Ligand binder design. Structure first.
Ligand SMILES: [Zn+2]
Ligand SMILES: [Zn+2]
Ligand SMILES: [Zn+2]
Ligand SMILES: [Zn+2]
Length: 143
């Protein structure tokens, strides 16, 4: 058979923090440090299908913070796509797993998930996750 009821999930790991206004965000974050964060993501969740994860893309954003005493806001992130993720609830043989994007993202990235409807500027925890469906009704298998 084929399971045609998997989804692709766009995932993003985020560290938002403030730095002295005289500094730059690329004194604090590197492509390499963010790629190492991607390497810590759990790649064998019960909800994971075949084909693993896309190439990770590090990003570094910087803006002066109007509300801060002379600080800049840094947003250091790494994003990748989980190609094939189960839909619904999944029983692994011993217990149930919720494969909805929120619980799945929190298990795989290990940080609190926020809907894309919530902007970075309105999020006040330092470390957090994004996850949203980028493709539905994909094969669970690599064939
Ligand atoms: Zn298939
Ligand atoms: Zn299949
Ligand atoms: Zn950091
Ligand atoms: Zn970072």
């Amino acid at each position: 058979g084929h399971m045609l009821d998997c989804k692709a999930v766009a995932l993003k790991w985020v560290h938002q923090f403030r730095i002295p206004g005289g500094d730059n965000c690329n004194f604090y974050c590197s492509y390499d440090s963010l790629y190492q964060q991607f390497n810590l993501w759990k790649k064998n969740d019960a909800c994971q299908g075949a084909d693993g994860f896309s190439t990770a893309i590090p990003k570094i954003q910087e803006a002066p913070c109007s509300d801060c005493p002379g600080s800049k806001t840094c947003i250091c992130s790494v994003q990748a796509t989980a190609w094939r993720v189960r839909n619904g609830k999944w029983f692994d043989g011993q217990q149930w797993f919720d494969c909805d994007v929120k619980p799945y993202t929190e298990r795989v990235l290990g940080r609190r998930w926020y809907d894309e409807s919530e902007a970075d500027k309105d999020i006040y925890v330092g470390y957090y996750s994004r996850g949203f469906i980028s493709n539905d009704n994909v094969h669970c298998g690599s064939q």
